[PDB]
Amino acid sequence: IPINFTISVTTEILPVSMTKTSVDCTMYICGDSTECSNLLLQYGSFCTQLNRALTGIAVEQDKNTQEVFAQVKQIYKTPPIKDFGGFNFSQILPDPSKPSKRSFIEDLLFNKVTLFNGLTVLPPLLTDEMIAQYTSALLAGTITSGWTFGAGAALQIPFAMQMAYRFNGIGVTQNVLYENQKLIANQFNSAIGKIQDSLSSALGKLQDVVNQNAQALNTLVKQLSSNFGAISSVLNDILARLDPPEAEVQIDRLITGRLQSLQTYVTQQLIRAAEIRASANLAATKMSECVLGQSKRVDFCGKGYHLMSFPQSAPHGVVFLHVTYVPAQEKNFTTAPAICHDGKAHFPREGVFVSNGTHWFVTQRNFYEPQIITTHNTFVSGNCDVVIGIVNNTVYDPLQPELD
Amino acid sequence: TLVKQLSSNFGAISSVLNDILARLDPPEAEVQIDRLITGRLQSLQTYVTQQLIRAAEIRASANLAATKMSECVLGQSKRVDFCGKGYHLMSFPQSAPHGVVFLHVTYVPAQEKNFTTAPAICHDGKAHFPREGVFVSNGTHWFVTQRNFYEPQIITTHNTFVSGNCDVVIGIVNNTVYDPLQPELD
Amino acid sequence: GRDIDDTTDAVRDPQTLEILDITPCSFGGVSVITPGTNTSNQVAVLYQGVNCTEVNVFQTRAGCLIGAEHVNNSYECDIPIGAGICASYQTSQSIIAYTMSLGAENSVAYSNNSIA
Ligand SMILES: *[C@@H]1O[C@H](CO[C@@H]2O[C@@H](C)[C@@H](O)[C@@H](O)[C@@H]2O)[C@@H](O[C@@H]2O[C@H](CO)[C@@H](O)[C@H](O)[C@H]2NC(C)=O)[C@H](O)[C@H]1NC(C)=O
Ligand SMILES: *[C@@H]1O[C@H](CO)[C@@H](O[C@@H]2O[C@H](CO)[C@@H](O)[C@H](O)[C@H]2NC(C)=O)[C@H](O)[C@H]1NC(C)=O
Ligand SMILES: *[C@@H]1O[C@H](CO)[C@@H](O[C@@H]2O[C@H](CO)[C@@H](O)[C@H](O)[C@H]2NC(C)=O)[C@H](O)[C@H]1NC(C)=O
Ligand SMILES: *[C@@H]1O[C@H](CO)[C@@H](O[C@@H]2O[C@H](CO)[C@@H](O)[C@H](O)[C@H]2NC(C)=O)[C@H](O)[C@H]1NC(C)=O
Ligand SMILES: *[C@@H]1O[C@H](CO)[C@@H](O[C@@H]2O[C@H](CO)[C@@H](O)[C@H](O)[C@H]2NC(C)=O)[C@H](O)[C@H]1NC(C)=O
Ligand SMILES: *[C@@H]1O[C@H](CO)[C@@H](O)[C@H](O)[C@H]1NC(C)=O
Ligand SMILES: *[C@@H]1O[C@H](CO)[C@@H](O)[C@H](O)[C@H]1NC(C)=O
Ligand SMILES: *[C@@H]1O[C@H](CO)[C@@H](O)[C@H](O)[C@H]1NC(C)=O
Ligand SMILES: *[C@@H]1O[C@H](CO)[C@@H](O)[C@H](O)[C@H]1NC(C)=O
Ligand SMILES: *[C@@H]1O[C@H](CO)[C@@H](O)[C@H](O)[C@H]1NC(C)=O
Ligand SMILES: *[C@@H]1O[C@H](CO)[C@@H](O)[C@H](O)[C@H]1NC(C)=O
Ligand SMILES: *[C@@H]1O[C@H](CO)[C@@H](O)[C@H](O)[C@H]1NC(C)=O
Ligand SMILES: *[C@@H]1O[C@H](CO)[C@@H](O)[C@H](O)[C@H]1NC(C)=O
Ligand SMILES: *[C@@H]1O[C@H](CO)[C@@H](O)[C@H](O)[C@H]1NC(C)=O
Incomplete structure (x- = not known):
C-alpha cells in the first residue's frame, strides 16, 4: 500500500494541419506557351481533377484546425487576482506585453520549429494570434470553472476545492489534498519548471511533417529539367529551333512526363492529407476528453491516474501538459x-x-x-x-x- | 468525369473507335488504337485510386458510427462530448439513406445561484x-x-x-x- | 546566373557588360465572392497573389480584394476569405469585408470562497 505520492507533468505532441499548397496544372506544364496549351487540350480534363483535389486538401486543413481548437462558446478571461491556493500558472497564462500575447512555453515552442512556376502557398484562415486566444480561453475556463464550462454554462469554484473533487474521482479521499496542500503545490510548480527547462534544450513529430512536405515540392520542381526523351527540357528552346510540323513530336513527350509527375505528386499528397486528418481527429478527441473533463481511460491522458490537462499551441500542432498522480513509496x-x-x-x-x-x-x-x-x-x-x-x-x- | 473522358483524342485522329477501324487499313490503325488504349487506361487507373482513398475514408466514418452505436445507445457513456454536449442520459438511432442519425438526450444545468x-x-x-x-x-x-x-x-x-x-x-x-x-x- | 532550382535569375548584356536581374511578371489566381444568385447579382473579385498596384480596393494579406467595403465591426464568418478576413452580404445592400470574431468576451467572478 503506498504511503506517499508525487505529481508529475508530461507533454504530448500532435500534428493538426499542414501547409496549404495549390499547383497550377497549365503553368507548370507549359508556362507562357500557346502551342503547348493547344496540345494539352487533347488530353481532356487532367487539369481540373488535380486542382479539385488540391482545393479539397486545402479546405480540409482549415476544417481540421477549426474542429480541434474552436470548442468554446465564449472567450473567458482570467481574473487579475491570482490566488489559486499556491498553484502558479505563470508560465502557462499569457503575458500581455508581447504583441502575440503568447505565454512563455508557447514562445519556446514557436522558436524551436521555425529556427512561381505554378506553385503557390495559401494563408491559413485562423492566424496564430487567434489560436493563442482560443487556448487562453480554454485555460482560463478550466482554471476558474473546472469541467462545468464544457457541459453548459460556466460555474465558478475555488481551485483547491476543484482539486479536491479531482482527487475524489480516483479513489483518494479529499482530506489527503486538504492536509497536504503545500506539498502538492510545490510539486506541481517544480514539474512545470522541469517542463520549461526541458523544452529549452524534442519536437520531431511536428518536423517530420514539414520535411516531407518540403521534399515533395523539391522533387516536383526538380522534375522540370528532365528531357523525358526530347532534345531539350525547355519549351522556349524547342519552339525556337523547330518548325511546328516537327516540334509536336517533342512537346508531346514533355507533356507526358510532366503529367505523370503531377499525378504522382497529387496521389502522395492525398494519402498524407488522410493521415493528418486522422491525427487531427485524435487531437480533437484528446482535447474534449482530457481538458474539458477528467478521463478514466487508462494511458489515454498521460501515464498514471489522470487529474487535469492544459493545452498549448505549437506551429501546425497542439501540445498537452497532462497532470497525473503516481504512488511513490510502498510497504509490505x-x-x-x-x-x-x-x-x-x-x-x-x-x-x-x-x-x-x-x-x-x-x-x-x-x-x-x-x-x-x-x-x-x-x-x-x-x-x-x-x-x-x-x-x-x-x-x-x-x-x-x-x-x- | 470518367464517362466524359471517353470523348478525347489522346493524340489519335478521332475519339471514336469505330471510325478508326473503318477509315484505316489494319497495319496502320494500330498506332491510333494504341494511343486510345493508353489514354483510357490512364483515365480508368486514376479513377480506381481516387475511389480507394474515398472508400478508406468512408470506412473510418463507419467504424466511428459503429462505436457510437455500441457505447451511446446500448449504454451510458462517461466520455465528454462523445454522445452529445452535456451530461449524457440516453440515445436513439434512426436510419437515413446511406447513414445513421443519433438523437442524444442530455442533462444540462440551468439558472445559477452564487x-x-x-x-x-x-x-x-x-x-x-x-x-x-x-x-x-x-x-x-x-x-x-x-x-x-x-x-x-x-x-x-x-x-x-x-x-x-x-x-x-x-x-x-x-x-x-x-x-x-x-x-x-x- | 542561376538559383537554387536552376533558373536564370541574372544575365550580363553583351554590349554594355552590366549586371541585370530577371524577375517573373506577377501571376496569381482569381477568386470571386458571391452571396448566391437568389438574393443579389453582385460579386467581389480577389486577386490572390498580387498587390493592388496592379489591376473600393482593400489590400489584404491573402491578396487584393476589389468590390467590397471595409467595416470596423466583427461578426461571425460567412465566407472565409483568409488570414482572419471574412466577407458577407448583410450590411442599400452591399458586400462587406470585416475581421472574424471568436466569440463573446466573458469573465467569471472567481474568488476563493464562492461557488455556484
Ligand atoms: C454572485 O455574487 C458575486 C459576488 O459575490 C458576492 O459576495 C458573496 C460572498 C455572496 O454573498 C454573493 O451573494 C455576493 O453577490 C457577484 O458577481 C458579480 O456579478 C456581476 C454580474 O453582473 C458582475 O458584473 C460582477 O463583475 C461580479 N463581481 C465580480 C467581483 O466580478 C454576483 O452578485 C453574482 N455572480 C454570479 C456569477 O452569480
Ligand atoms: C513524501 O515525499 C515528500 C517529497 O517527495 C516529502 O517532503 C519532503 O520532506 C523532507 C523532510 O521533511 C523535506 O526536507 C523536503 O523539503 C520535502 N519536500 C521535498 C520536495 O523533498 C515528504 O516528507 C514525504 N512524506 C513523508 C511522510 O515522509
Ligand atoms: C501496529 O500499530 C498499532 C497502532 O499504530 C500499534 O499499537 C499501539 O501500540 C502502542 C505500544 O504500547 C500502544 O501504546 C498503543 O495504544 C497501540 N495503539 C495505537 C492506536 O497506537 C502496534 O504497536 C503496532 N505494532 C507493531 C509491531 O509495530
Ligand atoms: C438561510 O437559511 C436559514 C435556515 O433555514 C434561514 O433561517 C430560518 O429561515 C426560516 C424560513 O424563513 C425561518 O422560519 C427561521 O426562523 C429561520 N431561522 C433563523 C435562526 O433565522 C434563513 O432565513 C435563510 N436566509 C437568510 C438570509 O439567512
Ligand atoms: C480569500 O482571499 C481573501 C482576499 O480576498 C483573503 O483575505 C486576505 O487576507 C487577509 C485575511 O482576511 C485580509 O488582510 C484580507 O481579507 C485579504 N488581504 C488583502 C491584502 O487583501 C483570505 O485570506 C482568503 N481566504 C481563504 C480561505 O482562502
Ligand atoms: C510564479 O513563478 C514566477 C516565476 O517562476 C514568479 O516570478 C512568481 O512570483 C510566482 N508566483 C507565485 C504566486 O508563486
Ligand atoms: C516485501 O517482502 C519481500 C520479501 O521479504 C521483499 O523482497 C520486498 O522488498 C518487501 N517490500 C518492501 C517494500 O520492502
Ligand atoms: C477464531 O477464533 C474462534 C474463537 O471462538 C475460533 O472458534 C475460530 O476457529 C478461529 N478461527 C480460525 C481460522 O482459527
Ligand atoms: C496461502 O498458502 C499457504 C501455504 O501454501 C496456506 O497456508 C495459506 O492458507 C494460503 N492462504 C490462503 C488460502 O488464503
Ligand atoms: C561595341 O561593343 C563594345 C562592347 O564589347 C562597346 O564598348 C562599344 O562601345 C560598342 N560600339 C559602339 C559603337 O557603341
Ligand atoms: C430565394 O430566397 C427566397 C427567400 O429569401 C426563397 O423563398 C426562395 O425559395 C429562394 N429561391 C432559390 C432558388 O433559392
Ligand atoms: C505591393 O505594393 C505595396 C505598396 O508599395 C508594397 O508594400 C508591397 O510589398 C507590394 N507587394 C509585393 C509582393 O511586393
Ligand atoms: C473605422 O476604423 C478606422 C481605422 O481603424 C477609423 O479611422 C474610423 O474612424 C472608424 N470608423 C468608425 C465608424 O468607427
Ligand atoms: C473557532 O473557534 C475557536 C475557539 O474559540 C477560535 O479560536 C477560532 O478563531 C474560531 N474560528 C475562526 C475562523 O475565528
Missing part, C-alpha cells in the same frame, strides 16, 4: 479477505484489511491511513465457515460506550 | 469533511448539498466524516453538527 502488509467477529463475517465497505503485526485496521487502497474497524466501515454477510482466508479479530461498535 | 463555501467544518477541535457533496451557505446558516442541484440539508454526523484536527486546513469555519442520536437517547 498482511491481508485478510474478511473478519469473523461473533459468528458473522465483516467485509470492508470501501477499503482493505491490513495489519502491521499485532492489530487489524481498515484503510483505503491508494493511500495509507489506518482506521479502527467499526460497524460503519464494514457490512455482514452470512457466517464465517465459507470464506477461505477469514481471520477472527474484533470490531468496535461505537454505540456501546455511549449507551452507558 | 454562494459562500468552505472546505471543512471545525466542530469541537475535530475537522469534518463532507461525505458526498459540498458545503454552502445562504449568509447565516450552513448546509451540505449535492454538487449538481441545489438541495440543502442540515449538517449531521451521517453527512460528514472526521479526520484529524482543525489546525492544518487552510480555510476552515466554525459551526455545529446535529448528532441525531442524542434526542432519541434522552
